[PDB]
Amino acid sequence: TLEILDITPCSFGGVSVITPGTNTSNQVAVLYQDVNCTEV
């Protein structure tokens, strides 16, 4: 069926890990750079 399909990269973006210094916590936020929060 003739019709116009785009394409697009998958997602990528690097994972970044926020942390307050391990001086303080073992808790870390995570930042998935430039994605939409689904594919997590």
């Binding site: 990269p9 990528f12 973006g13 690097g14 750079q33």
Partner: peptide, 22 residues
Amino acid sequence: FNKVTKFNGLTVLPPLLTDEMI
């Protein structure tokens, strides 16, 4: 801002300060 004007691992990171900050 009218004058002056995502593929292979190449990214573009967001500038830490958005224009409405600047």
